[PDB]
């Protein structure tokens, strides 16, 4: 059932990307209005695994006042907020990016840029959309800006060169000669990309390892005969494998991925009475062994210029809110927290890697962060059992 990786994405009528819509008929329009009088910012600061950023604009004929700086955005991009210098995006250090400019639709013009995770540096580029020319009822129009920060992938990127083509754009690879009996077993750390190159792969490639249990990549991205396996951020067992197969050169080259080290010390609180849990938490305070008249409060403080670790919470009661997808606010000395915010907006860092588990009745919720937090933040989660409550407060610098 060998099919090309590009053919393993099926078909979807949606977009599945970073849509930054700016069109008069759209919700986030730019024509003058009395409800809103401020510009629109579409900020995307994160690493892209062959991901797409789209910049929908109105047609020139329909809205001649609308202008875009640079006019050929995603082909030439601004480099400074204040200097306003436009540079070709081919000289920005980008690797294997591409651009598409679709004008067939009679309502809007689409401008997509596809970006690869192989960049050797942290790139930043803007694209401004000026609509101040359009004035209606003596009211000036609003502007907009798309800011894109392509962060260099903060982990080692690996490559299997199993195709006849030469990939000079990225030189760290294993190539065909490193295979023993057409079987490769690579030991990777957490968050370690494996960009395998193969024209023909298995239909269920990187989804079912040869025995040794099985684990799931957070992403399996197929693009242009490239299969990207993103190594999981947190693992619990050692006997773990994932298998892929190729028929290149009339040989069934097998690839086996397996992490080697397990069970980081999770910076969290262990409210469960279980002392034999497969997880290892920094703190510990039983909630079932404390009496009803006691409020449990534990704090996890983290301080590092760069983060690679996690924050977790294991408890046998119910967890409020649905941590760690949503969290509370720092409401201390006033009342018990009752407002719900998203963790992604609470910490102001993208691509946070969540995790959930149910060890018997013990609900365990974790989120791991890689990178640098802009500003120091704090948040709380509550675990309630019967009438007793435990407040875990994370303070991340």
């Amino acid at each position, epitope marked *: 059932d060998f099919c090309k990786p590009s053919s393993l994405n099926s078909e979807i009528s949606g977009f599945i990307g970073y849509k930054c819509n700016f069109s008069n008929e759209g919700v986030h329009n730019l024509k003058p209005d009395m409800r809103e009088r401020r510009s629109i910012f579409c900020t995307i600061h994160s690493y892209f695994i062959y991901d797409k950023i789209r910049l929908i604009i109105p047609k020139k004929s329909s809205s001649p006042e609308f202008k875009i700086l640079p006019e050929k955005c995603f082909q030439k991009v601004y480099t400074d907020y204040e200097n306003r210098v436009e540079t070709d995006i081919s000289e920005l250090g980008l690797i294997e990016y591409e651009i598409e400019e679709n004008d067939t639709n009679p309502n809007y013009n689409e401008r997509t840029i596809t970006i690869s995770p192989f960049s050797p540096k942290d790139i930043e580029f803007f694209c401004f959309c000026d609509n101040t020319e359009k004035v209606i009822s003596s009211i000036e129009g609003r502007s907009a800006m798309v800011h894109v920060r392509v962060l260099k992938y903060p982990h080692n990127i690996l490559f299997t060169n199993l195709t006849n083509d030469l990939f000079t754009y990225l030189p760290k690879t294993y190539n065909e000669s490193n295979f023993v009996s057409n079987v490769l077993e690579v030991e990777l750390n957490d968050g370690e990309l494996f960009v395998l190159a193969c024209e023909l792969i298995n239909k269920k490639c990187f989804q079912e390892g040869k025995e040794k249990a099985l684990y799931k990549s957070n992403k399996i991205i197929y693009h242009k005969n490239l299969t990207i396996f993103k190594a999981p951020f947190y693992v619990t067992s050692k006997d773990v494998n994932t298998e892929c197969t190729c028929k290149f050169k009339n040989n069934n080259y097998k690839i086996v991925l397996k992490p080697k080290y397990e069970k980081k010390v999770i910076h969290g*609180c262990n409210f469960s009475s279980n002392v034999s849990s497969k997880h290892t938490f920094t*703190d*510990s*305070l*039983d909630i079932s*062994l*404390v*009496d*009803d*008249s*006691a*409020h*449990i*409060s*534990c*704090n*996890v*403080h983290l301080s590092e210029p760069k983060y690679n670790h996690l924050v977790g919470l294991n408890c046998p009661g119910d967890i409020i809110p649905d941590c760690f997808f949503q969290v509370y606010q720092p409401e*201390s*000395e*006033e*009342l018990e927290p009752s407002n719900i915010v998203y963790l992604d907006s609470q910490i102001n860092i993208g691509d946070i890697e969540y995790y959930e588990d149910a060890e018997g009745d013990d609900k365990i919720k974790l989120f791991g962060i890689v990178g640098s937090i802009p500003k120091t933040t704090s948040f709380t989660c509550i675990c309630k059992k019967d009438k007793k409550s435990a407040y875990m407060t994370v303070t991340i610098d």
Partner: antibody
Amino acid sequence: QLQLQESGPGLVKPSETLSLTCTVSGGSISRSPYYWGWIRQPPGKGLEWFGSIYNNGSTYYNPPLKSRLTISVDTSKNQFSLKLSSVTAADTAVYYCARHGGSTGMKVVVIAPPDYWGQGTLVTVSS
Amino acid sequence: DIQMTQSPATLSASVGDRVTITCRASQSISSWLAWYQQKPGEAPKLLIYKASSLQSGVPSRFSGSGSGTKFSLTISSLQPDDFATFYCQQYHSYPYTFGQGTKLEIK
């Protein structure tokens, strides 16, 4: 059904020490996240707090009373003792053993009122 | 050191009345506070384990009403065995501070 029972001298000579020991029954102290402290009530007066030390052997005392008192848990007999030196004629009182949670300043802590008090013993400093 | 006070000094009421006892805290102890009653010669008992809460094993007459600085405990109806001395306390930060206390007697 945890219980605390006091033990100590009913009278001591002035300008001396004062050693009391509280025994815990029903429960245990080796695996408790609860602090254990002393409260002193002179007759005809309210209550005054006298330190508390964690099961593993921490030390927390009254800010003006860090000079003489020492407190020690022995987990083998499941007891804990208070030694207060340099008694004074105004140190007669009944001593209650309380099982109470910690403060709010620590990283990981239990916060609770003092429940399961001891019966209380009378210590006098007379002529 | 947080200072707690209990008001008023002494209480005299007849059987079947409702009486409120106020407690003042020097600083912000959030919602951490405990209400105790002690009969003469006996160890105090934890009537209320948290402001605006009730401890298990106590009749529903006592009611807690407090948050922040001011706190109050209300007794609806009275019993002949309700004579005691009260104690307002804050279990928020060492050292533990107890109120002066009020006297409940039947008259």
